[PDB]
Amino acid sequence: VRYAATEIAPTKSARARGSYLRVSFKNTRETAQAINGWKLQRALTFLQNVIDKKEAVPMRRYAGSTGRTAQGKQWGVSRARWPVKSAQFLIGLLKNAEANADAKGLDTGNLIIKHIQVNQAPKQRRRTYRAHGRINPYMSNPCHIELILTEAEETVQKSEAVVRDVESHLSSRQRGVRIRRALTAA
RNA sequence: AGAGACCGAUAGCGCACAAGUAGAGUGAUCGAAAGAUGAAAAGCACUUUGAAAAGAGGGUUAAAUAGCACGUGAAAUUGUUGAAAGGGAAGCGCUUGUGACCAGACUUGCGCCCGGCGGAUCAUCCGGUGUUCUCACCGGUGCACUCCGCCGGGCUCAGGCCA
RNA sequence: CCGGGACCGAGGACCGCGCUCUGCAAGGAUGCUGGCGUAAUGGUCACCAGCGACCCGUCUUGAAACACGGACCAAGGAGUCA
RNA sequence: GUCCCACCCAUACCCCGCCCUCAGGGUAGAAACGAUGCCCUGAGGAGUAGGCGGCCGUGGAGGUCAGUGACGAAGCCUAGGGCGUGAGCCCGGGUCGAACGGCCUCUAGUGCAGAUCUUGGUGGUAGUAGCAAAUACUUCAAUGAGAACUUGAAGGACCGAAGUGGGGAAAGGUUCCAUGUGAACAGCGGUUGGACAUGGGUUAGUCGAUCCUAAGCCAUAGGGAAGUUCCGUUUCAAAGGGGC
RNA sequence: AUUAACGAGAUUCCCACUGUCCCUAUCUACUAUCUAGCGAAACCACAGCCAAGGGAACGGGCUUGGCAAAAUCAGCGGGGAA
RNA sequence: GCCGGCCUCGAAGUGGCCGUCGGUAAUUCGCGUAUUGCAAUUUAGACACGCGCGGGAUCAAAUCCUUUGCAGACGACUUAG
Ligand SMILES: [K+]
Ligand SMILES: [K+]
Ligand SMILES: [K+]
Ligand SMILES: [K+]
Ligand SMILES: [K+]
Ligand SMILES: [K+]
Ligand SMILES: [K+]
Ligand SMILES: [K+]
Ligand SMILES: [K+]
Ligand SMILES: [K+]
Ligand SMILES: [K+]
Ligand SMILES: [K+]
Ligand SMILES: [K+]
Ligand SMILES: [K+]
Ligand SMILES: [K+]
Ligand SMILES: [K+]
Ligand SMILES: [K+]
Ligand SMILES: [K+]
Ligand SMILES: [K+]
Ligand SMILES: [K+]
Ligand SMILES: [K+]
Ligand SMILES: [K+]
Ligand SMILES: [K+]
Ligand SMILES: [K+]
Ligand SMILES: [K+]
Ligand SMILES: [Mg+2]
Ligand SMILES: [Mg+2]
Ligand SMILES: [Mg+2]
Ligand SMILES: [Mg+2]
Ligand SMILES: [Mg+2]
Ligand SMILES: [Mg+2]
Ligand SMILES: [Mg+2]
Ligand SMILES: [Mg+2]
Ligand SMILES: [Mg+2]
Ligand SMILES: [Mg+2]
Ligand SMILES: [Mg+2]
Ligand SMILES: [Mg+2]
Ligand SMILES: [Mg+2]
Ligand SMILES: [Mg+2]
Ligand SMILES: [Mg+2]
Ligand SMILES: [Mg+2]
Ligand SMILES: [Mg+2]
Ligand SMILES: [Mg+2]
Ligand SMILES: [Mg+2]
Ligand SMILES: [Mg+2]
Ligand SMILES: [Mg+2]
Ligand SMILES: [Mg+2]
Ligand SMILES: [Mg+2]
Ligand SMILES: [Mg+2]
Ligand SMILES: [Mg+2]
Ligand SMILES: [Mg+2]
Ligand SMILES: [Mg+2]
Ligand SMILES: [Mg+2]
Ligand SMILES: [Mg+2]
Ligand SMILES: [Mg+2]
Ligand SMILES: [Mg+2]
Ligand SMILES: [Mg+2]
Ligand SMILES: [Mg+2]
Ligand SMILES: [Mg+2]
Ligand SMILES: [Mg+2]
Ligand SMILES: [Mg+2]
Ligand SMILES: [Mg+2]
Ligand SMILES: [Mg+2]
Ligand SMILES: [Mg+2]
Ligand SMILES: [Mg+2]
Ligand SMILES: [Mg+2]
Ligand SMILES: [Mg+2]
Ligand SMILES: [Mg+2]
Ligand SMILES: [Mg+2]
Ligand SMILES: [Mg+2]
Ligand SMILES: [Mg+2]
Ligand SMILES: [Mg+2]
Ligand SMILES: [Mg+2]
Ligand SMILES: [Mg+2]
Ligand SMILES: [Mg+2]
Ligand SMILES: [Mg+2]
Ligand SMILES: [Mg+2]
Ligand SMILES: [Mg+2]
Hints:
The protein is of the alpha+beta class and 186 residues long. Helix content is 31%, strand content 25%. The chain contains 4 helices and 7 strands.
């Protein structure tokens, strides 16, 4: 179908997606944002350390009236949590993409999370019961997830010069000064 | 049974659909929401990862930016990427600056002279036909200092923006 | 009667009132010269800077009001017919 | 306190340009004119409630452009352009798939920010308030992708015969039993379920109903009431049953 | 007008008793609090630091001053004429 | 004026002496200047920052984690590894 990047050619990359997944959208957004631009192996290790509560996911946007911990000093922040259920879903998709890379014939030794994105899905409906005979809604917030992996090169050492454009519409008095200084210096 | 300067799915009857239906009330009674894949299902064979739901390849089609959560697909609200600002709100009016991006205008035209090239037939007169009854058209004559077109060289004039 | 500066050039054949009368400053700007011919002049947007700037609708002598309605968006919504 | 110079700036005053409104003139033996046009001259411009004029848009109808269109109509997006004082009009780029427009007349269910307005959809609050009555769970093994709330065994506990036990009446209607299972439901999980799918299950001369009458309700004889119907139950009635 | 017995009926004093008080201290269980899973509602013109002034005679916004530095957690009951 | 050697300077650390080297109309001359076309900033200073060479010098810590209870709602704090 149509991924959101559209500038990555589906020949030198691998991708995976999943839709209508019944997990918290707010928790998954904070988890996906922590692993973005990382290597495939570093990310897989990190997600398991979260499940075992040895490393923490920093909460930046959706962090209203939450708790504090010492495992957040790694990220320079003070509020962090351990979204176990979110990490499980992400690991499943990262494994599927890595499997897709092997079938194509890529080199899984150095792959990079190039694109990762979480969107809101249609909600599901339940009800509560309140005092004085009133009924209120009780809803869940699922999500869509997709990602793309590409190889890393980080190899550019080409810098341009004034060759692209030269002084082209100078005045007659400007041209006179340039020539005189050229003659004097040589 | 035939029609209309009527309405076009929040409209028109409450009902374009298994509608006086599903549902509520002890009962008399109350009473909805809900139309559109494609010309044709040709409704995705096979391989691979996964416990499975599914994903990635590969197929059908004019089109999958039409996959049954299906014509087109707006706003509120949200994700990623890119650009920028932030010492107890922000937004707005007048006027410069910086950065990014951009519409026009201009590229020549008429005339005169000199040379070359090509074609005619320029003025006049005779016949025919129109018409505003004196002005034209067609046929014939004309045949090189006339008429028309192109190219080469020189000259005058007019031409864009800011001073 | 002589100097020094600033802003402006509407009109588009002739005709008029006149004068210092081969002509003119008299019913509204012409003459000469240089640079450049493109993002240079010009335009749109974003942001910083100087000055300015109370929330709309409504009743009321008097509304920014410690007076009432208004969380946001789409579609419907009120002087007609005999 | 009194007197004197110079200087600063209002949308006021003076001069110039342009817009509109009002007033006054010119223009045919027509080489003549959107005569509803064009040329010349002067003055003026605040505004709620309210009055009048001119114009711009929307859905349909008659006429006309011998109008545009699958070589792409309509609709939608666009810190890309041009015109208009303004409501608005026109063009470029993208998406898309079957109809649509200009001009003069005709016609109306014809122009929205408000009405604690109607229907539908969506935010901040916010991963927040909370998920704390009824004393309580622990070890090993097995099943399974996955086990605190599934099964076995072993410990520890509660109900304590006016029971958290064994059976019924009203009410419900398959909730009963076996096998299996993706989603949804069991406000945590779930391999378990009163959930979901496929099959099976209720046997009477003796237990009930059926028979009798109670409080009561309604037919028949009759009397009211325009009538739907009201009274009346043994009465002011020629009202039955037994044998060969 | 009196009146034995009776009263979850109204009132005054006495004995015993005590954290009602001088004057407050300590302990236990469940919360709150942190984590995994699940997950609402009221309300909302726009917002949210002050002193004085004038003003519809008690300003978050106006005028003149004081000042003024990211993003945040547990409590609190002055104001928001909540 | 750049360097080097001696002294000196504490309010937010400065000045002086000496030496080598380089430049230098107080007087008077000889060659060069044009064409930037009759104006168009006189692109010229000082500090910061970046980049590229060539030489020297150097081989460190903090957080998570486990632990303590002189501390504590959670972070944080006093300790040990
Ligand atoms: K908290
Ligand atoms: K209806
Ligand atoms: K019913
Ligand atoms: K086609
Ligand atoms: K295709
Ligand atoms: K389509
Ligand atoms: K004028
Ligand atoms: K009112
Ligand atoms: K109000
Ligand atoms: K119309
Ligand atoms: K287009
Ligand atoms: K949650
Ligand atoms: K309990
Ligand atoms: K119990
Ligand atoms: K029987
Ligand atoms: K028998
Ligand atoms: K029976
Ligand atoms: K019977
Ligand atoms: K009886
Ligand atoms: K009767
Ligand atoms: K009593
Ligand atoms: K609390
Ligand atoms: K939690
Ligand atoms: K006051
Ligand atoms: K003001
Ligand atoms: Mg708080
Ligand atoms: Mg709390
Ligand atoms: Mg409740
Ligand atoms: Mg109730
Ligand atoms: Mg919600
Ligand atoms: Mg009909
Ligand atoms: Mg509908
Ligand atoms: Mg309808
Ligand atoms: Mg549809
Ligand atoms: Mg497929
Ligand atoms: Mg298409
Ligand atoms: Mg949808
Ligand atoms: Mg669609
Ligand atoms: Mg949007
Ligand atoms: Mg701003
Ligand atoms: Mg002839
Ligand atoms: Mg002029
Ligand atoms: Mg020139
Ligand atoms: Mg510019
Ligand atoms: Mg002001
Ligand atoms: Mg007040
Ligand atoms: Mg009122
Ligand atoms: Mg209100
Ligand atoms: Mg409609
Ligand atoms: Mg007026
Ligand atoms: Mg209509
Ligand atoms: Mg089109
Ligand atoms: Mg836009
Ligand atoms: Mg079609
Ligand atoms: Mg209407
Ligand atoms: Mg509206
Ligand atoms: Mg209004
Ligand atoms: Mg909580
Ligand atoms: Mg509970
Ligand atoms: Mg509670
Ligand atoms: Mg239990
Ligand atoms: Mg007991
Ligand atoms: Mg006991
Ligand atoms: Mg059972
Ligand atoms: Mg079972
Ligand atoms: Mg549950
Ligand atoms: Mg579950
Ligand atoms: Mg289950
Ligand atoms: Mg069932
Ligand atoms: Mg019996
Ligand atoms: Mg009767
Ligand atoms: Mg009778
Ligand atoms: Mg105050
Ligand atoms: Mg006062
Ligand atoms: Mg206020
Ligand atoms: Mg101020
Ligand atoms: Mg409180
Ligand atoms: Mg208060």
